[PDB]
Design a protein around this ligand. Structure first.
Ligand SMILES: Nc1ncnc2c1ncn2[C@@H]1O[C@H](COP(=O)(O)OP(=O)(O)O)[C@@H](O)[C@H]1O
Ligand SMILES: [Mg+2]
Lengths: 87, 604, 98, 107, 93, 95, 88, 107, 93
DNA sequence: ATCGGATGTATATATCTGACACGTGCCTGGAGACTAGGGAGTAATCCCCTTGGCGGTTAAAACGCGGGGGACAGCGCGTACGTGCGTTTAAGCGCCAAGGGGATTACTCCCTAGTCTCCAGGCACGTGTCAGATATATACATCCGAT
DNA sequence: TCAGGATGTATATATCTGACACGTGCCTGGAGACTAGGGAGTAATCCCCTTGGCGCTTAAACGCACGTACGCGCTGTCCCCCGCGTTTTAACCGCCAAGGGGATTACTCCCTAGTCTCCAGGCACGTGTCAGATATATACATCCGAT
């Protein structure tokens, strides 16, 4: 009856409505619509897919099983958005 | 009511006077006292001469202790208040072993050293502690202060007993959201309107800055194995606390290691066990000779000075002993194919996965037949332990012994709930999900005087300690644990004081698998504990399976009985990846992706 | 009647309070769960460091903040004050991601 | 004789032997001249000094005596020059410089 | 376990522009990354310049061209001025 | 004669079908020399260099006008304006 | 009285109004305002300034005085707008 | 013995000797393997074949028997994968892909 | 003179795929530039990839990783398959 | 709705000029030793990451409500765009003159890099500390929403 | 408009910690020979670019005038989103267990690259054709706009 999960609402829903609003305020918007909270999840998921794909490619090439901060940094730099700090 | 003559001589309670001692005015008054260290070392060598091993090494280190050593070298009634009756200043009675514990506490007090109280559960440890603090109050004339760090669950119990058998003492517990906590701080703590503070492991980390600013006479600690790690945040924080001495009320120390015991000792008397390698190499693991049991084993003489435990086996008697019935179970076909699948493949920690397969393959997603999902005998049909469990549950039910299952995975508890409902028994589940009130009501439901609760699931390491299920008769440790005393406390949830009838505790084991390795290592650690501390106080035709497993248990007991200290610390760490021969070993694209059409001018 | 701010003022205060800080605005554990779920992308069971996830969250939040700035500009351009998915789509199309 | 460092001879602060080694080992080309490391070290030294001066000014303006990533971001983004150089670069824990569109402000 | 870095050198530069301010470790890592990035950009552009013109070597002329080609205008002016004065001092001494 | 917009759609069809250069040749070439006089005196060019420059300029302006049109449509209009093109360039990381 | 060069026209105005309209149509627009012309002239002038500066830097590095198509292609590729067809 | 080229004994059409020469004398690494030229030649051949097939399809669609830069443009922009790969290039003399916004059409 | 082209190899591939069409000179030049651009992209990615791992050798493993880093999706899949096919044929023969 | 009308749209013809085929030689890729060093494999050490589970604090997050202000439709309306027509004007193409700029093409040497051999002096790492940046509290002064 | 609240904004203070200074080991940057080949200088040779012009064709660009339809401002009217209070729940620490993964630090060795020497075919260059694709008219059909 209950050995089946029936739990764990989608992880994209973990990007809550108020977090989207905080990002929006730091961006500088005053008034928000109601479908922004779905368009934003879509765009974030796409961006993460691309970056993680490249990072995992680097990791597999090095014959590792651990994605390292330098792998992520190389992936972002290849995508064209350098990240100072980490590594 | 009539013990008030002892209260004579105490100064009247007044925060202004208390502030002289409570607040330690000296901002950096912390210093190494040569006098206290000399007295400690002198008494310690008086008991026995073996302790120079630490001292000489420390003299090889910082030489301003080497000169203390030289001073101790060149220069070379304290009557215990036996309290043949119950001490007057505590309203009530104390049993003779309790009295002996109290006298041990006092004798360690008037020797400038401490001692871990590690009595067996139920032997009124807090009674010993309150009695000793009252000794300091009425006789030694130190009202306070005293810190009583404890687990959050028992805070109310500590306070209830402290106000019951010694009402004169004023004490309070910190709690509540930070605002009323701070109110209590500013009103009483820094106000100095108490004698005994009670906190929790979490609050000590939380409210540490005010608690720094009191010269602490002692720092009591309830079950102390929490502090068995000396890199734990609690251990780090509970070292800047300026204090005279310390106490470490606990249950059983040395649960899975020896270095653990070293750190537990290091807490009380840092100036002796200041070096890790000293303890780690003097009579810890080495590879020298027959010394393992010729000398270093005999060298308990370092401990008996400061440690105590009173075996509840014979100091009480009523709990008929125990009944351990390990059952070696063979894997079934689904287990065979799955276990091989893990061996040669989200699946990390292959050792954890192998434990899952040894419990029920339905834990793996997509294992059971379906959808649609049913609950018929196709559930029991694929898990060997569950088959034996079904047979044994039926046998117990016809006998009529309501049972506690102490699983180790709550998901396994989900499958067990489904199986139980399908078999029309009813239960009450407690795990890391049920809130407090749920836990209390479930315990009450099980412990109703006429309760229709056959099975009663839990998780082995959960529920704290106040859970009391002596009404139960059988405990089925569906899984074995790494730490033997984890399962020991679990299986004493039923063997706790007050249990009337002899109980049986089963331990399903998956033969020819990881579970055998886990059981072997757990027995290593249990026998280590015994040596170090406990001395110096289709159907399987269940009957033949029982006999075979009993013979196996006798054989392994014989195997591990005759091991030695350095040998028993080996931790063979035999790789479980290889089970029946393993080698550490685990297109054409004809798609022609797409071809659009209509490349002509026909958009318009 | 209890004191109540008129619509817009709390929003302006929030803008000027979040444009001054520097911490992360998405929760660490939800973001990590999302990352590891996506990580079944071109591989199967994988291990992540912690610096990896922190770098990934830094990059994501910077990207989203820039996107929201461009969206705000589009919404104001339409003689409006609210941002809408049409604004998200326009901004993200012009930048060249769609 | 007595060793006299190439950084000392050129009068710079950044290392020139290390820069020479990096040019040789990065297989940027087969041969590297003797003045290329000096020129490169001087340029790197100049840019570092420029950004550090701006960051220190920002730190003083914030009533602090230690540079932090926020101060680095403020120094970079305020001038139209290092902003153009570091255009695609995101600085960890940088935040964003404050502005609010004038349309959103009240009457 | 030895890891080369620019922390010592950027700290020497800092202690002569603002002789009393310090710098946190995270800012230090950011500065080291910035120096590495700019070094890679200039070196790569100089390498491509040498490859374009059939030359087999990198020299101060290529470095100057790469600087004047990457840095924006008014910044590049001062950069090349200071590079030239440093190299002339090295040559004279 | 013809209703407004008819010739406009006709011209869009005409010009999205072809591939030639849209800016005159000599005016652009003259502009390139004049704008190149500032950086360094007395430069010489060659026809292929100027043709590459023109081709790049054509492509850039065409993409810019596509973005501007899409911006104008976003604001419930069909007429493009300087506000539209400024918004497009600023979003596209240039202003 | 006309010995001087009083007669002359600015070169940015050589980008005629209908040429900008042809570009606009190929982009796919239907109505053009009156100020799009001036704004377009401005943006084109800026773009040309950047590309030509980089190309001239390449040529003067190579110790030449002619800007070759390969130099312009290198300049564009550096700007980030690589161009296929003129060699390279 | 008689010599047979690596292109032939690999089965490809693109040159492997020239690719190996470029990889060596291109300052990409100190040492170049033995299968790298073969792999690179294969990849280049595949991409060339793919784009040329699409271009020929378009040219036949327009009743012509010679691929021109217009057909190259049209094929590249109509195939989305090649469009992403070549998202930043500009094929000279390629024109633009026909497209009119729906709102602009007459009622 | 003596400028290498790729024109003849592209023309061979064309006469394999569409054995009735042709290429004008401008299209041919565009195709040659395309091949050179892709070559330099892949080679540069492989060079950086070997530098990241402290290797001094470019081999087919780095070439493959750079291919699947640069080409998107189905293009990458087919190109990888074809490259592995060619390499195995070469080694066997 | 129909008729007129302007506008692509297929269609046969002549032009030519740009793609494709063919011979040369020369230089680069292939065959064949020879060799050294790079990279694969193995063993020991130590720190981080995994999986499943537990217990606690406490701010954020979810939800409901109410009310107002902003978005979205309609309604004029009065420009500023379009479309069409007539007329200059300039682009484009030819043509003239004389040079320098530049890219091979072929030696010729110098000088300035790489390579090797020590060897000390930079620099990185492992230890203290203490000064700056926190968090706390309080008083203040400073906008905002209802007369 | 003015008095009434809510909210940063300073000021003063106790605390934590992570920059900063200091001492050693070592490894690599510098001194000093030696060498060889890259590049700088010279000097032929041919092709393109420049700066002043001139004459001619012929489409585009420009200017002007109706005159719509659209961009803009007003008004109305919902209704959707913000502000705020109230529960509750999920993040966030802290823990526990074992083992594997990844980095270093040696060692060892083999094989596969680079380096040569020859030597022939593959590829580039210069030629010579011919057919694919224009441009030109021509009849066809096919939206668009006014009665
Ligand atoms: N008269 C008595 N003498 C001795 N012990 C008693 C007496 N009355 C009660 N006790 C027990 O003393 C115990 C002290 O608490 P204890 O069980 O030791 O908790 P913990 O094990 O957590 O310290 C109580 O549980 C209580 O049952
Ligand atoms: Mg207790």
């Amino acid at each position: 009856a209950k050995r089946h999960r029936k739990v764990l609402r989608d992880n994209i829903q973990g990007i809550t409505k108020p977090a989207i609003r905080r990002l929006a305020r730091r961006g500088g918007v005053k008034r928000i619509s109601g479908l922004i909270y779905e368009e934003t999840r879509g765009v974030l998921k796409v961006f993460l897919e691309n970056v993680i794909r490249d990072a995992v490619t680097y990791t597999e090439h090095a014959k590792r099983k651990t994605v390292t901060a330098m792998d992520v940094v190389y992936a972002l730099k290849r995508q064209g958005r350098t990240l100072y700090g980490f590594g | 009511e009539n013990l008030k003559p002892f209260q004579v001589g105490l100064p009247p309670h007044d925060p202004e006077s208390n502030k002289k001692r409570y607040l330690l005015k000296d901002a950096n008054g912390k210093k190494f006292d040569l006098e206290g260290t000399t007295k400690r070392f002198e008494h310690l060598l008086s008991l026995s001469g073996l302790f120079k091993h630490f001292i000489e090494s420390k003299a090889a280190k910082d030489p301003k202790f080497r000169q203390v050593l030289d001073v101790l070298e060149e220069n070379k009634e304290s009557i215990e208040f036996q309290f043949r009756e119950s001490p007057a200043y505590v309203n009530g009675q104390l049993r003779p072993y309790q009295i002996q514990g109290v006298n041990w506490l006092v004798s360690l007090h008037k020797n400038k050293i401490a001692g871990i109280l590690a009595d067996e559960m139920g032997l009124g440890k807090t009674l010993q502690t309150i009695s000793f603090l009252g000794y300091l109050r009425y006789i030694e004339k130190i009202p306070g202060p005293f810190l009583v760090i404890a687990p959050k669950s028992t805070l109310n119990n500590w306070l209830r007993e402290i106000n019951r058998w010694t009402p004169d003492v004023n004490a309070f517990i910190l709690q509540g959201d930070k605002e009323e906590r701070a109110e209590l701080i500013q009103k009483k703590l820094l106000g100095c309107d108490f004698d005994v503070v009670i906190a929790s492991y979490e609050i000590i980390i939380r409210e540490k800055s005010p608690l720094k600013k009191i010269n602490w006479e002692y720092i009591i600690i309830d079950e102390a194995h929490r502090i068995k790690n000396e890199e734990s945040m609690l251990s780090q924080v509970l070292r800047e606390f300026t204090s005279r001495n310390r106490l470490l009320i606990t249950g059983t120390p040395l649960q899975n290691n020896l270095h653990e015991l070293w750190a537990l000792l290091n807490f009380l008397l840092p100036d002796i066990f200041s070096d890790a390698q000293d303890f780690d190499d003097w009579f810890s693991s080495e590879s020298t000779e027959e010394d393992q049991d010729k000398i270093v084993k005999q060298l308990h003489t370092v401990l008996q000075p400061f440690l105590l435990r009173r075996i509840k086996s014979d100091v009480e008697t009523s709990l008929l002993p125990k009944k351990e019935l390990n059952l070696y179970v063979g894997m079934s076909s689904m287990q065979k194919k799955w276990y091989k699948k893990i061996l040669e493949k989200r699946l990390l920690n292959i050792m954890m996965q192998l434990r899952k397969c040894c419990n029920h393959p339905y834990l793996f997603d997509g294992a059971e037949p379906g959808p649609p999902y049913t609950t018929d005998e196709h559930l029991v049909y694929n898990a060997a332990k569950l088959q034996v469990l079904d047979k044994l549950l039926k046998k117990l039910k016809e006998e009529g012994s309501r049972v506690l299952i102490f699983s180790q995975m709550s998901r396994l508890l989900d499958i067990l709930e489904d199986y139980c409902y399908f078999r029309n028994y009813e239960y009450c589940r407690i795990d890391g999900s049920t809130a407090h009130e749920d836990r209390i009501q479930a315990i009450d439901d099980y412990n109703a005087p006429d309760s229709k609760k056959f099975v009663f699931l839990l998780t082995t390491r959960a529920g704290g300690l106040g859970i009391n299920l002596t009404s139960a008769d059988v405990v089925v440790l569906y899984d074995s644990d790494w730490n033997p005393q984890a399962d020991l406390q679990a299986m004493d949830r039923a063997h706790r004081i007050g249990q009337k009838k002899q109980v049986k505790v089963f331990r399903l084991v998956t033969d020819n698998s990881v579970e055998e390795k886990i059981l072997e290592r757990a027995t290593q650690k249990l026998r280590l504990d015994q040596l170090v501390i406990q001395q110096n106080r289709d159907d399987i035709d269940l009957d033949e399976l029982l006999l075979k497993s009993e013979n196996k248990t006798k054989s392994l007991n014989a195997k591990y009985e005759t091991l030695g200290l350095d040998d028993l610390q080996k931790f063979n760490q035999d790789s479980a990846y290889e089970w029946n021969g393993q080698d550490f070993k685990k297109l054409l694209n004809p798609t022609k992706r797409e071809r659009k059409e209509n490349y002509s001018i026909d958009n318009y | 009647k209890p004191h109540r701010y008129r619509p817009g003022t709390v929003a302006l205060r929030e803008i000027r309070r979040y444009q001054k800080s520097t911490e992360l605005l998405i929760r660490k554990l939800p973001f990590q769960r999302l990352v590891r779920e996506i990580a079944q992308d071109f591989k199967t069971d994988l291990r992540f460091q912690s610096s990896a996830v922190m770098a990934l969250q830094e990059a994501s939040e910077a990207y989203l903040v820039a996107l929201f700035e461009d969206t705000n500009l589009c919404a104001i351009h339409a003689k409006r004050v609210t941002i809408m998915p049409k604004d998200i789509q326009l901004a993200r199309r012009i930048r060249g991601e769609r | 004789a007595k060793a006299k460092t190439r950084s000392s001879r050129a009068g710079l602060q950044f290392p020139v032997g290390r820069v020479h080694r990096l040019l040789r080992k990065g297989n940027y080309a087969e041969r590297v001249g003797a003045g290329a490391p000096v020129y490169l070290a001087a340029v790197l030294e100049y840019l570092t000094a420029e950004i550090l001066e701006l960051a220190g000014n920002a730190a003083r303006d914030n009533k602090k005596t230690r540079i932090i990533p926020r101060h680095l971001q403020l120094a970079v983004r305020n001038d139209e020059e290092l902003n153009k150089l570091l255009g695609r670069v995101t600085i960890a824990q940088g935040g964003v410089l404050p502005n609010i569109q004038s349309v959103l402000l009240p009457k | 376990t030895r890891k080369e870095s620019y922390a010592i050198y950027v700290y020497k530069v800092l202690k002569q522009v603002h002789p009393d301010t310090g710098i946190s470790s995270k800012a230090m890592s950011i500065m080291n990354s910035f120096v590495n990035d700019v070094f890679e950009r200039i070196a790569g552009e100089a390498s491509r310049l040498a490859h374009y013109n059939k030359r087999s070597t990198i020299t101060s002329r290529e470095i100057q061209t790469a600087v004047r080609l990457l840095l924006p205008g008014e910044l590049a002016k001062h950069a090349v001025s200071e590079g030239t004065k440093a190299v002339t001092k090295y040559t004279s001494a």
